[PDB]
């Protein structure tokens, strides 16, 4: 009954929110400042205390020391180089050569060492964050999961069963098969379960414009890999980062090959990465260079093939568990109808077969809806199918 009475008394208090929130001070929307009620404790003290005693302390780079005396040699970004000194607040220990240090503008002396340069495009491919794919969702390839998982996490979760036995566990592993087989999806489960630094690399990101520019990204990558205690490096589509050296006449594709050779040298030869585990993934493994195929770099060579029957039925149980269906259907008939198929194709049959129930007006799909999915996805889209020339990997 109080139709306007709740309206205007609602509205003058919804406006009267703003009518005193202007009296608070939230207004004068900025160009990059902050709210007025926050920093109010750097108001009289740190305004004259983080400013008036506090310096600028320009950062530099050390060339070298010399004996018997401090007498360091500095280097800066563009300007000249100097003979410089410590402060009293620093020990002469951690002023090792090739280091960035903070330096005052007047006496030009050293205040604090700095962390080295990281080239933060390498920092961009640190994953920082984990996907949600469970090893439950990678059904059909259980022994591949186990044979991978014993290489990936068992020394990391238990570095005693390998020590007390007296073996060094293998460090390198690649994954390969036809496309859509569950390789990338299988890697997402590893990034789900693990805990160390998972630094992903997609191989096409390393193609640079300059000469040898990608190799420095490799070097910085393995440096910040060496900074951590244990680390996991992921590789994807490494056919782009190198197939093989073949060169003749006009030198083509050389810039990729120098990057691939730098990857070889960072994997083996003169002091091993130590506690760094790598993981590759490709579509066609035939093109890859045999020195890259050497163990000590690529110890495990997990195959991903098509599921026989039972892996397929298990995949139907995975992609079909979470949808409203007719109860008394069978999946075994469908796995009889899909001899050569991927889990992507099985998933597309499920996600299409729901849409067949969405076609007319129902809520739960049927066996004949599945039959409408099978001939369409398999046999109507069978013109392309993407698989057979990748079975031979050509």
């Amino acid at each position: 009954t109080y139709s306007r009475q709740i309206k205007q008394v609602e509205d003058d208090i919804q406006q009267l929110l703003k009518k005193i929130n202007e009296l608070t001070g939230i207004k004068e929307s900025d160009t990059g400042l902050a709210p007025p009620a926050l920093w109010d404790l750097a108001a009289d003290k740190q305004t004259l205390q983080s400013e008036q005693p506090l310096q600028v302390a320009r950062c530099t780079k050390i060339i070298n020391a010399d004996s018997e005396d401090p007498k360091y040699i500095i280097n800066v970004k563009q300007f000249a180089k100097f003979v410089v000194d410590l402060s009293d607040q620093v020990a002469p220990t951690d002023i090792e050569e090739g280091m960035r240090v903070g330096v005052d503008r007047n006496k030009y002396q050293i205040h604090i060492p700095l962390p080295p340069k990281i080239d933060p495009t390498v920092t961009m491919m640190q994953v920082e964050e984990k996907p949600d794919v469970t090893y439950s969702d990678v059904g059909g390839c259980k022994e591949q999961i186990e044979k991978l998982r014993e290489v990936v996490e068992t020394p990391l979760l238990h570095p005693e069963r390998f020590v007390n036995l007296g073996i060094e566990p293998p460090k390198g592993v690649l994954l390969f098969g036809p496309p859509g087989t569950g390789k990338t999806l299988c890697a997402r489960a590893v990034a789900n379960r693990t805990d160390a630094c998972f630094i992903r690399v997609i191989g096409s990101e390393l193609v640079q414009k300059y000469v040898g520019e990608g190799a420095r990204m490799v070097r910085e990558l393995f440096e910040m890999a060496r900074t951590k205690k244990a680390c996991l490096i992921f590789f994807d589509e490494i056919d782009a980062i190198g197939g093989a050296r073949f060169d003749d006449g006009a030198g083509g594709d050389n810039e990729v090959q120098r990057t691939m050779l730098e990857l070889i040298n960072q994997l083996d030869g003169f002091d091993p990465r130590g506690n760094i585990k790598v993981l590759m993934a490709t579509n066609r493994p035939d093109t890859l260079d045999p020195a890259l195929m050497r163990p000590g770099r690529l110890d495990r060579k997990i195959e991903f093939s098509l599921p026989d029957l039972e892996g397929r039925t298990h995949i139907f149980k995975i992609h079909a568990r979470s949808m409203s269906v007719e109860r008394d259907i069978r999946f075994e008939l469908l796995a009889r109808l899909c001899p050569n198929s991927t889990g992507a194709e099985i998933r597309s049959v499920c996600t299409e077969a729901g849409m067949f129930a969405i076609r007319a007006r129902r809520k739960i799909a049927t066996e004949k809806d599945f039959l409408e999915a099978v001939n369409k996805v398999i046999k109507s889209y069978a013109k392309f199918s993407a698989t057979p020339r990748y079975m031979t990997y050509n």
Binding site: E28, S29, D30, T31
Partner: protein
């Protein structure tokens, strides 16, 4: 004529380049050789004129 020997002792004036203006009587100006600066305006200059 006498005033100029005093007035010519003043330092020069920079040339700049307005990118675009923003809030509270300020603009964004980048000199060719140097970097972009956030400066204010003088009172005899209008924002829409900028």
């Amino acid at each position: 004529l006498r005033e100029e020997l005093q007035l010519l002792q003043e330092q020069g004036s920079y040339v700049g380049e307005v990118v675009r203006a923003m809030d509270k009587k300020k603009v964004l100006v980048k000199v060719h050789p140097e970097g972009k600066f956030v400066v204010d305006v003088d009172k005899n200059i209008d924002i829409n004129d900028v």
